[PDB]
C-alpha cells in the first residue's frame, strides 16, 4: 500500500514510519512546510505507526536528537518514538480488511488527519490545540502534551491489569479529540477500510 505523508505545518517536521522492530520504507525523513513524502508499505503489515518529530538535529550519518518522538537518536526510525507523539496506526490486509486509527495514548505533539485516498471508508482527525490547552502536569518542556501513563506510571493510567477506566487526563484528550483513542480501553475509534486501500497522513491539516 501507498501512504503519502504531507507536512502542512508552518514548521519543519521529521516524519517517521515504523512497525516497532523495523523501519517502514526508509523509516524517516525531513519534511519542510508543504513537502510530501511517498512511502510503500508491505501488504499484511501489522501494527504500523506514522508520527511526526519536532526540533530535531541530525549530523551527516543520520544521528542526533529530536525534542518529541525521538527513536533512539536516528533519522531513519527502526523503533517507535519517545512520547509525546500523536500516532497514525494501521494494520493492513487482516482478513480482507485494513484497520486505521489515530491515538493519543502516547500523548500529542502535532495535529493530524489520517484519510484513505481510495474508496470505501472515511478518515479520522485530531486537529485541536491540545498543546495550548494541555493540563500543567502533562506539559512536556520539549513541546507537546504527554499522556498520564508516561508521566505518572500507575496501573490505572497504564491499564497494566487490563482493567482501567477513563480518568481526568484521558477525558481531556477525548473532549478535544473524540475520534482518537484517549486511553488503552477507550471505546474503539478504529475505521475499517477495504483491504489494500491507500492513504494520506497530513500534519497540521487545518493551519
Which among 23, 24, 73 is positioned nearest to 53, based on CA atoms?
73
Distance of CA 189 to the CA centre of its chain: 14
β-pair partners for 57: 65
Query: What method did the depositors use to determine the structure?
Result: X-ray
State the resolution, in angstroms.
2.0
d(CA 157, CA 107): 12
- Full residue range of the structural domain in which residue 83 is found: 1-207
Query: How many folded domains does the chain comprise?
Result: 1
Q: How far apart are CA 23 and CA 206, in angstroms?
A: 28
| Residue from 13, 24, 12, 154 nearest 77 by CA | 24
Tallying the residues shown for the chain, one arrives at 207
User: Looking at residue 19, which CATH number applies to its domain?
Assistant: 2.60.110.10
- 165-171: long-range contacts (C-beta < 8 A, 24 or more apart)? 169/135, 169/138
Give percent helix, percent strand, percent coil of the chain, each to the nearest 5: 10, 40, 50
> Which contiguous run of DSSP H or E holds residue 90?
strand 87-94
CB-CB contact of 73 with 16 (8 Å): no
CB atoms within 10 A of CB 65: 14
Where helices occur in the chain by DSSP H, the ranges are 130-133, 148-152, 155-158, 168-176
Amino acid at each position: 500500500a501507498t501512504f503519502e505523508i504531507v507536512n502542512r505545518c508552518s514548521y519543519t517536521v521529521w516524519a517517521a514510519a515504523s512497525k516497532g522492530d523495523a523501519a517502514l520504507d526508509a523509516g524517516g525523513r525531513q519534511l519542510n512546510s508543504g513537502e510530501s513524502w511517498t512511502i510503500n508499505v508491505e501488504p499484511g503489515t501489522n501494527g504500523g505507526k506514522i508520527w511526526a518529530r519536532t526540533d530535531c538535529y541530525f549530523d551527516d550519518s543520520g544521528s542526533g536528537i529530536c525534542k518529541t518522538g525521538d527513536c533512539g537518536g536516528l533519522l531513519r526510525c527502526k523503533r517507535f518514538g519517545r512520547p509525546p507523539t500523536t500516532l497514525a496506526e494501521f494494520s493492513l490486509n487482516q482478513y480482507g480488511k485494513d484497520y486505521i486509527d489515530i491515538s493519543n495514548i502516547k500523548g500529542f505533539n502535532v495535529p493530524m488527519n489520517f484519510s484513505p485516498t481510495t474508496r470505501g471508508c472515511r478518515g479520522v482527525r485530531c486537529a485541536a490545540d491540545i498543546v495550548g490547552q494541555c493540563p500543567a502536569k502533562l506539559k512536556a518542556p520539549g513541546g507537546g502534551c504527554n499522556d498520564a501513563c508516561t508521566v505518572f506510571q500507575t496501573s490505572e493510567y497504564c491499564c497494566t491489569t487490563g482493567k482501567c477506566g477513563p480518568t481526568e487526563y484521558s477525558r481531556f484528550f477525548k473532549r478535544l479529540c473524540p475520534d482518537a483513542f484517549s486511553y488503552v480501553l477507550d471505546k474503539p475509534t478504529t475505521v475499517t477500510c477495504p483491504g489494500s486501500s491507500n492513504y494520506r497522513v497530513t500534519f497540521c491539516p487545518t493551519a
